Amino acid sequence: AKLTIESMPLSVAEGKEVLLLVHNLPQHLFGYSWYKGERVDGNSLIVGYVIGTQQATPGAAYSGRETIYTNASLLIQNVTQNDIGFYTLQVIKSDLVNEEATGQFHVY
């Protein structure tokens, strides 16, 4: 089944926090990368996470707000009014047949 992102909650009050849950995560993974926006693009990288070491390394889009968990979920605190709300996960499989999914939340 398709890798999908669920926003918990779907609508988030400005200043509050949103959890991005990941469904249908494939097995035998090497790591995860979360991006701000709709695309895999290193300039929008929030965090790359190596499962084996549990090492999270921030990218240029990391803002202090974002925390990645071992189950691939991304917690975003202190959500801004201007955030269009698109976030993109790339799962990096140990065979490098990698998968992407984009989720969205709606700030009010």
XYZ file of N, CA, C and O in Angstrom:
432
model
N 0.843 -1.239 0.000
C 0.000 0.000 0.000
C 0.863 1.267 0.000
O 2.039 1.249 0.402
N 0.241 2.370 -0.412
C 0.941 3.628 -0.600
C 1.320 4.209 0.790
O 0.499 4.283 1.703
N 2.578 4.608 0.910
C 3.054 5.431 1.986
C 2.171 6.697 2.072
O 1.916 7.366 1.048
N 1.615 6.971 3.258
C 0.790 8.166 3.445
C 1.103 8.877 4.763
O 1.590 8.260 5.733
N 0.820 10.181 4.774
C 1.039 11.030 5.915
C -0.318 11.473 6.420
O -1.111 11.963 5.633
N -0.578 11.326 7.725
C -1.810 11.825 8.351
C -1.463 12.940 9.326
O -0.634 12.747 10.206
N -2.116 14.091 9.180
C -1.939 15.232 10.079
C -2.799 15.095 11.326
O -4.016 14.999 11.215
N -2.178 15.115 12.498
C -2.927 15.013 13.797
C -2.625 16.268 14.615
O -1.552 16.341 15.155
N -3.485 17.285 14.665
C -4.792 17.353 13.976
C -4.640 17.889 12.567
O -3.581 18.404 12.222
N -5.700 17.781 11.776
C -5.700 18.243 10.380
C -5.671 19.756 10.296
O -5.023 20.320 9.429
N -6.439 20.410 11.163
C -6.375 21.866 11.310
C -5.723 22.170 12.653
O -5.993 21.500 13.646
N -4.802 23.128 12.648
C -3.951 23.400 13.802
C -4.031 24.888 14.078
O -3.885 25.694 13.149
N -4.292 25.249 15.329
C -4.273 26.653 15.704
C -2.856 27.167 15.563
O -1.894 26.482 15.926
N -2.738 28.367 15.031
C -1.468 29.053 15.032
C -0.788 28.955 16.406
O -1.450 29.105 17.407
N 0.503 28.667 16.458
C 1.212 28.571 17.738
C 1.178 27.185 18.366
O 2.027 26.865 19.190
N 0.232 26.332 17.946
C 0.078 25.001 18.536
C 0.867 24.006 17.703
O 1.606 24.390 16.797
N 0.743 22.733 18.039
C 1.595 21.743 17.486
C 0.808 20.690 16.671
O -0.371 20.425 16.935
N 1.479 20.126 15.670
C 0.859 19.124 14.799
C 1.792 17.931 14.713
O 3.005 18.085 14.657
N 1.228 16.738 14.764
C 2.012 15.518 14.595
C 1.680 14.924 13.214
O 0.504 14.722 12.889
N 2.711 14.650 12.426
C 2.541 14.002 11.119
C 2.803 12.503 11.267
O 3.939 12.112 11.434
N 1.757 11.696 11.266
C 1.893 10.252 11.391
C 2.102 9.634 9.993
O 1.525 10.082 9.012
N 2.892 8.573 9.957
C 3.246 7.873 8.748
C 2.584 6.502 8.768
O 2.760 5.751 9.732
N 1.805 6.202 7.726
C 1.186 4.889 7.523
C 1.865 4.146 6.374
O 2.373 4.767 5.427
N 1.838 2.818 6.445
C 2.378 1.927 5.391
C 3.857 2.171 5.158
O 4.320 2.297 4.036
N 4.584 2.237 6.259
C 6.015 2.384 6.237
C 6.571 1.032 5.791
O 6.251 0.030 6.405
N 7.361 0.971 4.699
C 7.949 -0.332 4.332
C 9.023 -0.811 5.313
O 9.497 -0.025 6.128
N 9.422 -2.077 5.226
C 10.409 -2.630 6.177
C 11.803 -2.610 5.557
O 11.972 -2.311 4.376
N 12.789 -2.927 6.394
C 14.214 -2.986 6.006
C 14.700 -1.621 5.530
O 15.209 -1.436 4.420
N 14.501 -0.646 6.412
C 14.793 0.736 6.112
C 16.188 1.103 6.548
O 16.755 0.486 7.450
N 16.752 2.089 5.879
C 18.016 2.693 6.288
C 17.751 4.007 7.070
O 18.413 4.288 8.090
N 16.809 4.806 6.586
C 16.488 6.058 7.250
C 15.347 6.830 6.630
O 14.624 6.304 5.791
N 15.209 8.072 7.084
C 14.125 8.997 6.732
C 14.671 10.372 6.512
O 15.625 10.773 7.168
N 14.028 11.105 5.618
C 14.297 12.532 5.450
C 12.973 13.231 5.317
O 12.127 12.830 4.530
N 12.795 14.286 6.096
C 11.617 15.109 6.065
C 11.997 16.410 5.435
O 13.046 16.989 5.725
N 11.123 16.873 4.558
C 11.298 18.114 3.839
C 10.117 19.014 4.108
O 8.987 18.563 4.244
N 10.394 20.299 4.122
C 9.339 21.277 4.075
C 8.899 21.467 2.636
O 9.700 21.786 1.769
N 7.598 21.381 2.421
C 6.993 21.577 1.116
C 6.598 20.256 0.489
O 6.490 19.248 1.166
N 6.426 20.295 -0.839
C 5.868 19.196 -1.629
C 6.897 18.304 -2.336
O 6.496 17.299 -2.952
N 8.186 18.640 -2.245
C 9.233 17.947 -3.027
C 10.385 17.489 -2.171
O 10.736 18.134 -1.181
N 11.007 16.391 -2.616
C 12.318 16.013 -2.149
C 13.303 16.986 -2.771
O 13.376 17.097 -3.992
N 13.994 17.746 -1.927
C 14.921 18.777 -2.382
C 15.760 19.200 -1.196
O 15.225 19.706 -0.183
N 17.061 19.001 -1.302
C 17.977 19.214 -0.182
C 17.959 20.619 0.431
O 18.237 20.779 1.619
N 17.625 21.619 -0.383
C 17.467 22.996 0.074
C 16.290 23.197 1.026
O 16.283 24.175 1.751
N 15.303 22.294 0.967
C 14.160 22.267 1.846
C 14.218 21.130 2.882
O 13.184 20.789 3.471
N 15.402 20.553 3.119
C 15.551 19.464 4.070
C 15.387 19.949 5.510
O 16.084 20.868 5.955
N 14.502 19.292 6.248
C 14.315 19.593 7.659
C 15.294 18.740 8.455
O 16.135 19.269 9.202
N 15.192 17.433 8.275
C 16.006 16.508 9.020
C 16.193 15.166 8.283
O 15.249 14.625 7.715
N 17.430 14.664 8.281
C 17.749 13.297 7.863
C 18.052 12.464 9.092
O 18.814 12.904 9.971
N 17.459 11.272 9.166
C 17.519 10.420 10.342
C 17.952 9.000 10.010
O 17.221 8.282 9.295
N 19.084 8.567 10.570
C 19.622 7.209 10.335
C 19.105 6.322 11.434
O 19.419 6.546 12.648
N 18.372 5.288 11.053
C 17.744 4.427 12.048
C 18.763 3.696 12.946
O 18.635 3.691 14.179
N 19.773 3.114 12.324
C 20.803 2.382 13.013
C 21.505 3.127 14.131
O 21.758 2.554 15.176
N 21.878 4.368 13.872
C 22.544 5.215 14.873
C 21.571 6.057 15.729
O 21.962 6.601 16.751
N 20.330 6.179 15.289
C 19.362 7.155 15.821
C 19.856 8.613 15.697
O 19.458 9.438 16.469
N 20.682 8.934 14.706
C 21.239 10.270 14.537
C 20.385 11.118 13.601
O 20.225 10.811 12.396
N 19.792 12.170 14.167
C 19.058 13.180 13.400
C 20.009 14.324 13.035
O 20.636 14.899 13.910
N 20.130 14.639 11.760
C 20.950 15.760 11.292
C 20.034 16.799 10.590
O 19.342 16.469 9.638
N 20.029 18.052 11.068
C 19.173 19.065 10.504
C 19.668 19.521 9.151
O 20.836 19.430 8.881
N 18.748 19.973 8.297
C 19.088 20.566 7.003
C 18.725 22.029 7.051
O 18.300 22.552 8.094
N 18.872 22.697 5.913
C 18.651 24.150 5.841
C 17.247 24.592 6.220
O 17.077 25.725 6.583
N 16.243 23.723 6.112
C 14.871 24.116 6.454
C 14.505 23.871 7.926
O 13.437 24.265 8.359
N 15.361 23.203 8.691
C 15.132 23.037 10.124
C 14.979 24.405 10.753
O 15.785 25.275 10.509
N 13.960 24.578 11.576
C 13.651 25.871 12.178
C 13.645 25.865 13.711
O 13.298 26.853 14.304
N 14.033 24.763 14.344
C 13.868 24.617 15.787
C 12.531 24.012 16.193
O 12.333 23.697 17.363
N 11.599 23.827 15.262
C 10.221 23.475 15.624
C 9.962 21.992 15.499
O 8.943 21.497 15.956
N 10.873 21.290 14.855
C 10.553 20.011 14.249
C 11.366 18.912 14.889
O 12.575 19.027 15.001
N 10.698 17.831 15.268
C 11.326 16.662 15.910
C 10.881 15.389 15.214
O 9.685 15.149 15.040
N 11.834 14.550 14.855
C 11.552 13.259 14.188
C 11.673 12.126 15.193
O 12.569 12.132 16.082
N 10.753 11.178 15.086
C 10.743 10.007 15.933
C 11.143 8.768 15.139
O 11.147 8.779 13.895
N 11.491 7.707 15.864
C 11.924 6.445 15.258
C 10.871 5.787 14.371
O 11.235 5.098 13.427
N 9.591 6.000 14.670
C 8.495 5.531 13.831
C 8.197 6.444 12.604
O 7.107 6.390 12.040
N 9.143 7.326 12.276
C 9.050 8.262 11.170
C 8.171 9.505 11.358
O 8.252 10.433 10.558
N 7.367 9.559 12.418
C 6.519 10.702 12.668
C 7.355 11.938 12.900
O 8.478 11.864 13.390
N 6.791 13.078 12.508
C 7.414 14.379 12.672
C 6.489 15.261 13.488
O 5.340 15.502 13.103
N 6.991 15.737 14.625
C 6.211 16.639 15.479
C 6.639 18.052 15.154
O 7.823 18.348 15.183
N 5.691 18.916 14.824
C 5.991 20.323 14.536
C 5.317 21.223 15.576
O 4.109 21.311 15.626
N 6.114 21.918 16.355
C 5.585 22.818 17.384
C 5.570 24.262 16.873
O 6.211 24.573 15.866
N 4.811 25.111 17.560
C 4.790 26.557 17.304
C 4.584 26.877 15.816
O 5.340 27.621 15.188
N 3.554 26.258 15.266
C 3.190 26.389 13.859
C 2.860 27.847 13.511
O 2.110 28.501 14.237
N 3.398 28.320 12.383
C 3.231 29.707 11.917
C 1.974 29.883 11.065
O 1.513 28.948 10.416
N 1.441 31.102 11.072
C 0.229 31.449 10.327
C 0.447 31.289 8.820
O -0.415 30.785 8.129
N 1.613 31.727 8.340
C 1.988 31.681 6.906
C 2.278 30.267 6.325
O 2.455 30.122 5.106
N 2.366 29.239 7.169
C 2.704 27.889 6.691
C 1.573 27.302 5.818
O 0.466 27.017 6.290
N 1.889 27.058 4.550
C 0.920 26.436 3.621
C 0.627 24.995 4.065
O -0.426 24.439 3.757
N 1.548 24.413 4.824
C 1.270 23.201 5.559
C 1.700 21.918 4.871
O 1.394 20.831 5.385
N 2.424 22.027 3.750
C 2.930 20.829 3.035
C 4.243 20.364 3.610
O 5.174 21.134 3.773
N 4.322 19.079 3.906
C 5.575 18.446 4.365
C 5.708 17.114 3.663
O 4.725 16.375 3.509
N 6.937 16.790 3.284
C 7.214 15.594 2.455
C 8.229 14.675 3.103
O 9.340 15.084 3.421
N 7.842 13.414 3.247
C 8.724 12.372 3.739
C 9.362 11.549 2.602
O 8.662 11.059 1.742
N 10.673 11.333 2.660
C 11.280 10.285 1.856
C 11.784 9.200 2.786
O 12.556 9.482 3.703
N 11.327 7.979 2.554
C 11.821 6.803 3.219
C 12.921 6.207 2.368
O 12.703 5.942 1.140
N 14.085 5.979 2.978
C 15.217 5.444 2.270
C 15.346 3.998 2.672
O 15.735 3.698 3.795
N 15.011 3.106 1.740
C 15.080 1.683 1.953
C 16.505 1.213 1.792
O 17.298 1.849 1.111
N 16.833 0.118 2.467
C 18.179 -0.467 2.397
C 18.532 -0.965 0.961
O 19.697 -0.976 0.637
N 17.532 -1.268 0.114
C 17.735 -1.529 -1.351
C 17.696 -0.282 -2.290
O 17.817 -0.424 -3.515
N 17.510 0.908 -1.706
C 17.401 2.202 -2.394
C 16.277 2.321 -3.411
O 16.341 3.171 -4.267
N 15.234 1.508 -3.289
C 14.031 1.711 -4.062
C 13.170 2.544 -3.123
O 12.364 2.028 -2.370
N 13.371 3.844 -3.155
C 12.859 4.714 -2.108
C 11.462 5.181 -2.403
O 11.025 5.127 -3.536
N 10.762 5.628 -1.363
C 9.367 6.044 -1.458
C 9.175 7.432 -0.890
O 9.916 7.841 -0.027
N 8.203 8.152 -1.423
C 7.859 9.490 -0.987
C 6.361 9.600 -0.680
O 5.516 8.907 -1.259
N 6.046 10.511 0.228
C 4.658 10.902 0.481
C 4.613 12.314 1.000
O 5.518 12.756 1.693
N 3.578 13.046 0.601
C 3.406 14.415 1.014
C 2.148 14.456 1.856
O 1.136 13.834 1.514
N 2.239 15.108 3.013
C 1.077 15.381 3.854
C 0.824 16.876 3.921
O 1.675 17.694 3.552
N -0.354 17.233 4.404
C -0.697 18.631 4.592
C -1.546 18.872 5.856
O -2.416 18.092 6.159
N -1.271 19.949 6.571
C -2.194 20.436 7.627
C -2.588 21.869 7.308
O -1.952 22.502 6.481
N -3.637 22.360 7.971
C -4.235 23.652 7.650
C -4.247 24.540 8.894
O -4.917 24.242 9.885
N -3.482 25.625 8.841
C -3.322 26.491 9.992
C -4.491 27.460 10.023
O -4.908 27.954 8.985
N -5.014 27.727 11.200
C -5.990 28.801 11.372
C -5.620 29.631 12.615
O -4.835 29.243 13.476
